């Protein structure tokens, strides 16, 4: 055996299908039907009668289970030794090495090494935005001159044109009356950061963004929104991990500012317990920050951006609307999946059809969570040329949003819960991106 350890995958968390946001953690009790519809023990017993609509399926046909199934880790056999070894430990992928697995001992005994690993992070197609970010990170790393650090690769893996649609409450008030556009076009992008750790790629950062160009009507035009952020905390060295995140995030703001976007938007929202934003099965000791801590962290990152003469200034949404002399909810930027489109639906219902009644009160209530970042200020923003993106569209269904990658990771036991598993998951992720390309 490679190690002395007996290893297996932890059970993943499933949905309860009752409260539409309820989740079933590890070792919990739940009910299943056809392994498709799972129900919380509390939510299932708080059900009308026996018949449950799914077609009505009776509660008699449901399975009472505990979320404690442990799938053992897989082994691979050396085609010369016969030695059985963990697939994750030796990082053997059948697509990269279709000739069969040969252990390190056999390779050295015959004075050879594995064939070069195609489908690497470096060999992913590059972009102007990706090169811009990885130059910034690697230049910073050489300045710090830590011998433990490795080369960082940043690649944009998806780009497509989409639209966000105004929800029925806001649509009935402002869209049907002609006061607001019914949809806002934007380009979505997914990019990841990789670090070479002992000769092996490790994906440690991911990000999805929404970019609304000069074609977009107000109030969305020339604005960028960060849909989701995620990380795996195994960047080496640890003492430089936060700074690298700052380099990527500030670099993105610097890049879109150069392109002509005037404002960036960040919703400082930590994930719920047991929830994964981009990377499936985070390490158990990678703690989720509390909201106050996360807000201060973004402040520090933005403060550095201001000092670097990249970000002009930043304010919370409540302060921004006051300076913008906002009066109606139709003047607030409308982003896909954002907090505010959902809340404006609730605000109109409670107000009897008003888009202004509790607008400032709601913004003040949640002001510390929403950051409005001004990249271009004053007279310069009034007369800018059209935004032209030098990078082409990158069709990649696996990265059209965060759902496909999470599903693939769930379906293939691709965990990021440890360095070895995250390296195996990185290798599998890279192979998928190269074949789907
Ligand atoms: C102040 O401490 C931090 C500040 C920022 C981050 C970043 C990040 O990754 N965030 C910020 C939101 O909370 C942490 C999420 C990571 C995470 C941790 C544990 C379980 C999870 N499930 N899903 C996501 C997830 C995603 C790092 C780079 C960008 C900001 C991480 C920790
Ligand atoms: Zn092992
Ligand atoms: Zn539930
Ligand atoms: Zn061998």
Query: CA triplet 272, 256, 317: central angle to 5 degrees?
Result: 50
Rounded distance between C-alpha atoms, residue 246 and residue 267, angstroms? 16
Instruction: Report the CATH number that the domain containing residue 37 is assigned in CATH.
Output: 2.10.110.40
Rounded distance between C-alpha atoms, residue 329 and residue 341, angstroms? 10
* Resolution value, angstrom units: 2.3
Rounded distance between C-alpha atoms, residue 177 and residue 355, angstroms? 13
The closest-lying atom of ligand 1 relative to the alpha carbon of residue 205 is 28
Rounded distance between C-alpha atoms, residue 31 and residue 257, angstroms? 51
Name the residue among 43, 53, 51, 108 with its Cα closest to residue 80: 108
The closest-lying atom of ligand 1 relative to the alpha carbon of residue 282 is 20
Rounded distance between C-alpha atoms, residue 391 and residue 193, angstroms? 18
Instruction: Judge if the beta carbon of residue 229 lies within 6 A of ligand 1.
Output: yes
Instruction: Judge if the beta carbon of residue 245 lies within 6 A of ligand 1.
Output: yes
Q: Cα dist. 50→56, 57, 61, 69, 362 in Å?
A: 10, 8, 10, 27, 41
Residues with C-beta atoms within 5 A of ion ligand 4? 78, 80-81, 103, 106
Which residues, in sequence order, are bridge partners of residue 165?
183
Tokens of 350: 């409670």
**H/E/C letters for each residue in the chain?**
CCCCCCCEECCCCEECCCCCCCEECCCCEEEEECCCEEEEHHHHHCCCCCEEECCEEEHHHCEEEECCCCEECCEEECCCCCCEEEHHHHCCCCCCCCCCCCCHHHHHHCCCCCCCCCCCCCCCCCCHHHHHHHHHHHHHHHHHCCCCCCCEEEEEEEEEEEEEECCHHHHHHHHCCCCCCCEEEEEEEEEEEEEEECCEEEEEEEEEEEEECCCCCCCCCCEEEEEEEEECCCCCCHHHHHHHHHHHHHHHHHHHHHHCCCEEEEECCCCCCCCCCCCCCCCCCCCCCCHHHHHHHHHHHHHHHHHCCCCCEEEEHHHHHHHCCCCCHHHCCCCCCCHHHHHHHHHHHHHCCCCCCCHHHHHHHCHHHEEEEECCCHHHHHHCCCCCCCCCCECCHHHCCCHHHHHHHHHCCCCCCCHHHHHHHHHHHHHHHHHHC
Tokens of 369: 């969570």
Tokens of 132: 């811009």
Backbone angles phi, psi at 5, to 5 degrees: -95, 140
Q: Which residue has the tokens 């030796």?
A: 90
The best mutation among 152, 195, 230 to test binding of ligand 1, ranked by most ligand atoms within 8 Å of the C-beta, falls on 230
Which residues, in sequence order, are bridge partners of residue 77?
84
Domain residues for the domain of 60 are: 8-67
Q: How many angstroms is it from 3 CA to the middle of ligand 2?
A: 4
Give the residue, by CA position, lying nearest to ligand 1 atom 16. Answer: 230
Tell me how long the chain is.
437
Largest CA distance in the chain: 80
User: What separation, in Å, do the N-terminal and C-terminal C-alpha atoms of the chain show?
Assistant: 36
Tokens of 227: 């849909």
Rounded distance between C-alpha atoms, residue 196 and residue 211, angstroms? 30
């Amino acid at each position: 055996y490679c190690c002395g350890r007996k290893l297996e995958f932890s059970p993943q968390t499933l949905c309860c299908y009752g409260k539409q946001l309820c989740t079933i953690p590890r070792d919990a009790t739940y009910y299943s039907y056809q392994n498709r519809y799972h129900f919380c023990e509390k939510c299932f017993n708080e059900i009308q009668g026996e018949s449950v609509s799914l077609t009505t399926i009776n509660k008699e046909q449901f399975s009472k289970r505990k979320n404690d199934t442990l799938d053992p880790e897989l082994f691979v056999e050396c085609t010369e030794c016969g030695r059985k070894m963990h697939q994750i430990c030796v990082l053997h992928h059948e697509i990269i090495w279709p000739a069969g697995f040969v252990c390190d001992g056999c390779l050295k005994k015959s004075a050879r090494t594995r064939k070069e690993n195609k489908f690497s992070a470096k060999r992913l197609p590059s972009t102007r935005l990706g090169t811009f970010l990885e130059n910034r990170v690697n230049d910073f790393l050489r300045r710090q001159n830590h011998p433990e650090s490795g080369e960082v690769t940043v690649r944009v893996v998806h780009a497509s044109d989409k639209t966000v649609e105004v929800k029925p409450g806001m649509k009935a008030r402002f869209v049907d009356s002609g006061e607001m556009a019914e949809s806002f076009p934007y380009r979505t992008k997914a990019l990841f950061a990789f670090e070479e750790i002992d000769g092996v790629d490790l994906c440690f950062f991911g990000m999805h963004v929404q970019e609304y160009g000069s074609d977009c009507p107000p109030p969305n035009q020339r604005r960028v929104y960060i849909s989701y952020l995620d990380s795996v905390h195994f960047f080496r060295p640890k003492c430089l991990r936060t700074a690298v995140y700052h380099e990527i995030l500030i670099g993105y703001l610097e890049y879109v500012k150069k392109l002509g976007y005037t404002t960036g938007h960040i919703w400082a929202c930590p994930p719920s317990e047991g929830d994964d934003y981009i990377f499936h099965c985070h390490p158990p000791d990678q703690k989720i920050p509390k909201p106050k801590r996360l807000q201060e962290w973004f402040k520090k990152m933005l403060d550095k951006a201001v000092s670097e003469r990249i970000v002009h200034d930043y304010k919370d949404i409540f302060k921004q609307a006051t300076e913008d002399r906002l009066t109606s909810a139709k003047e607030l930027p409308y982003f896909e999946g954002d907090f505010w489109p959902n809340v404006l639906e609730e605000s109109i219902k409670e107000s009897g059809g008003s888009g202004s009644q509790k607008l400032y009160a709601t913004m003040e209530k949640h002001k510390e969570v929403f950051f409005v970042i001004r990249l271009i200020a004053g007279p310069a923003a009034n007369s800018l040329p059209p935004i032209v993106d030098p990078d082409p569209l990158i069709p990649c269904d696996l990265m059209d949003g965060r759902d496909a990658f999470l599903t693939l990771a769930r379906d293939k036991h691709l965990e990021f819960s440890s360095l070895r598993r995250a390296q195996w998951s990185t290798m599998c992720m890279l192979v998928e991106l190269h074949t789907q390309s």
